[PDB]
């Protein structure tokens, strides 16, 4: 049976099911102080969350990182690549779900619905009467979607039900969709006063929502971040929303997760979730499933099932 | 010039625009013990909520009530009819707006987005984790919408964007849909999960959504009510939730508002609105506009813009 190291906190039916086929190596933390000379000879990893390079560099006989999401930017691709270790995520199985994510945060963002719920469970809808009118809606917006792959589509298919213009930005354009393409950003920012954030946070992605794009975005502006916190200037977004640079903002997603700066917490007129995008039982169980099936395909034919794009590989034992 | 009573709250663009060719006359509450002899020359009321019959028979030269709001079942349109009184509403302005509202609250009752936003602004991220996972999701669901008029079929439109199958029960087929008819309440609810209610509130729906509903509906069921809260047996619903007969709740409307059963209040899987499906700033101004429209052609022309179907309703002066 190969053996596959899980370190740190991981769903549990990704242990559940490991033993279909490995042995399992738990360790506390992935760090690679907690690494002894009896786990040197581990084949697979399975993760969810960063995965340090000396942590992976201390297996000699490593072959296959099986992360947990389908952002991999926790794992050094390159070195992986290099070392001709083969990584795999988890796409389309949690596509749906995600989408969904977005749009209900979208919803609360604009008409403020959980301030309401807490104006109600409060007693302050018997003692005060209505709930104030949300300053914005969805009525009337135009969305402009930086990303649309798998989880961007989705999120526009739902949007052009509610009855709302879509434009996108990417490298390269998506020909045979009915979506407006901007070639760069800003441009997109300018033209569209709803703005989702759905890419991958690399080095290409870094602070690209800076304030630029928010002042370009305008004073109807509301961001949405589903993708990466890294992919927004935090402070930038912070100064915006003082200002009354933009109207709003909903985030999933953060610089320092956990942490959240105290400043985000003090605006009316923003929406905060803690990384919960994928986070329903059916959804997880599907993206445990999705890592332990990455690894028997592996070990059982030489195939993973999905792969990353930097690491087309096939197994040599 | 005309003479409007307003009775009680009402927005105050409708106050702002009733000037143009009207003019106002204010009482504190929809009372007719606040009625002076002085008032009895009044020919219109302009009112959102209750209109009690003593109130409207305490003015023997009322020509129209204009209504704020979509649903009117706060006027005896019977008694209104018999006295050959119009009524007018405000459909369609609102339409998109109650239907995104829908979505919204679906989407909370279901991944407990209010309660995640909860648990980070509490702290509760960085000492205890992450949020735990929604036991419930949209994925994979099956949705049977009570009422398919105007909103509901907005909703419709909207739930097709996500992958779910839809199926709807009204008293007469609507044809040329692709949506599965059921001919019965209680047949459409034991062949779906979700249930949203969005039927107006009259005799024939009070409490239809009763305990035979809620058990055919299921174990995962959820519910959701953006219509009126007499049509759904408020105590029946407590006990399914209690009971563990359904999964979940969502809900903008309730049978004694603004008063919310306590018990109702205690359940982890439940979201609630203070009735604010309408209530944005763009809507309610578009409401406003259509109130004071109805009363301006109706003493202009003598047809107003949308007349209730019980009073189809030419001034005669
Ligand atoms: N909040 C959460 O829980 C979740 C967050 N995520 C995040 O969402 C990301 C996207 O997921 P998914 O849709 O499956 O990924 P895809 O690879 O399908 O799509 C990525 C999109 O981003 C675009 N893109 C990438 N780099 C750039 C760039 N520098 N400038 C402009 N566009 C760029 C791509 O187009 P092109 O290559 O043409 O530029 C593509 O349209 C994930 O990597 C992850 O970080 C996903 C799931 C859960
Ligand atoms: N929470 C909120 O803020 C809002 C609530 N509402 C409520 O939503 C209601 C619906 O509005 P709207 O869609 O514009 O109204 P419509 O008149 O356009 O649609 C009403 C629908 O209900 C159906 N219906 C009526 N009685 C029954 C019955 N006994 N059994 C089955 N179906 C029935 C109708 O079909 P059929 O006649 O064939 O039965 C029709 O499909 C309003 O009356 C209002 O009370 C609306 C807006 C705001
Ligand atoms: O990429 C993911 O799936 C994530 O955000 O966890
Ligand atoms: O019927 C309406 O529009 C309402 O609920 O106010
Ligand atoms: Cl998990
Ligand atoms: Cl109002
Ligand atoms: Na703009
Ligand atoms: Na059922």
């Given at each position: 049976?190969?053996?596959?190291?899980?370190?740190?906190?991981?769903?549990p039916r990704?242990?559940?099911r490991?033993?279909?086929?490995?042995?399992?190596?738990?360790?506390?933390?992935?760090?690679?102080?907690?690494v002894?000379?009896?786990?040197?000879?581990?084949?697979?990893?399975?993760?969810?969350?960063?995965?340090?390079?000396?942590?992976?560099?201390?297996?000699?006989s490593?072959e296959?990182?099986?992360?947990?999401?389908?952002?991999?930017?926790?794992?050094?691709?390159?070195?992986?690549?290099?070392?001709?270790?083969?990584?795999?995520?988890?796409?389309?199985?949690?596509?749906?779900?995600?989408?969904?994510?977005?749009?209900?945060?979208?919803?609360?963002?604009?008409?403020?619905?959980?301030?309401?719920?807490?104006?109600?469970?409060?007693?302050?809808?018997?003692?005060?009467?209505?709930?104030?009118?949300?300053?914005?809606?969805?009525?009337?917006?135009?969305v402009?979607?930086?990303?649309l792959?798998?989880?961007?589509?989705?999120?526009?298919?739902?949007?052009?039900?509610?009855?709302?213009?879509?434009?996108?930005?990417?490298?390269?354009?998506?020909?045979?969709?009915?979506?407006?393409?901007?070639?760069?950003?800003?441009?997109?920012?300018?033209?569209?006063?709803?703005?989702?954030?759905?890419?991958?946070?690399?080095?290409?992605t870094?602070?690209?929502?800076?304030?630029?794009?928010?002042?370009?975005?305008?004073?109807?502006?509301?961001?949405?971040?589903?993708?990466?916190?890294?992919?927004?200037?935090?402070?930038?977004?912070?100064?915006?929303?003082?200002?009354?640079?933009?109207?709003?903002?909903?985030?999933?997603?953060?610089?320092?997760?956990?942490?959240?700066?105290?400043?985000?917490?003090?605006?009316?007129?923003?929406?905060?979730?803690?990384?919960?995008?994928?986070?329903?039982?059916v959804?997880?169980?599907?993206?445990?499933?999705?890592?332990?099936?990455?690894?028997?395909?592996?070990?059982?034919?030489?195939?993973?099932?999905?792969?990353?794009?930097?690491?087309?590989?096939?197994?040599r034992?």
């Amino acid at each position: 049976r190969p053996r596959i190291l899980v370190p740190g906190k991981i769903n549990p039916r990704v242990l559940e099911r490991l033993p279909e086929m490995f042995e399992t190596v738990r360790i506390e933390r992935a760090d690679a102080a907690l690494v002894t000379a009896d786990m040197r000879d581990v084949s697979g990893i399975a993760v969810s969350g960063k995965l340090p390079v000396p942590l992976m560099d201390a297996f000699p006989s490593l072959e296959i990182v099986a992360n947990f999401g389908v952002g991999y930017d926790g794992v050094d691709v390159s070195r992986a690549a290099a070392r001709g270790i083969v990584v795999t995520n988890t796409p389309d199985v949690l596509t749906e779900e995600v989408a969904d994510t977005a749009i209900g945060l979208l919803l609360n963002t604009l008409r403020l619905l959980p301030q309401a719920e807490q104006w109600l469970r409060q007693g302050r809808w018997v003692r005060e009467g209505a709930f104030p009118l949300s300053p914005l809606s969805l009525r009337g917006r135009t969305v402009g979607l930086f990303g649309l792959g798998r989880i961007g589509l989705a999120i526009a298919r739902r949007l052009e039900a509610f009855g709302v213009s879509i434009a996108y930005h990417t490298r390269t354009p998506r020909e045979g969709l009915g979506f407006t393409y901007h070639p760069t950003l800003v441009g997109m920012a300018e033209a569209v006063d709803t703005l989702i954030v759905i890419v991958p946070g690399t080095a290409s992605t870094l602070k690209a929502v800076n304030a630029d794009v928010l002042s370009a975005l305008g004073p109807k502006g509301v961001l949405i971040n589903v993708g990466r916190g890294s992919t927004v200037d935090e402070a930038a977004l912070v100064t915006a929303l003082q200002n009354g640079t933009i109207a709003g903002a909903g985030l999933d997603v953060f610089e320092n997760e956990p942490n959240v700066p105290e400043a985000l917490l003090s605006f009316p007129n923003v929406s905060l979730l803690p990384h919960v995008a994928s986070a329903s039982v059916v959804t997880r169980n599907a993206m445990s499933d999705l890592v332990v099936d990455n690894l028997k395909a592996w070990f059982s034919t030489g195939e993973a099932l999905t792969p990353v794009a930097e690491t087309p590989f096939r197994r040599r034992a």
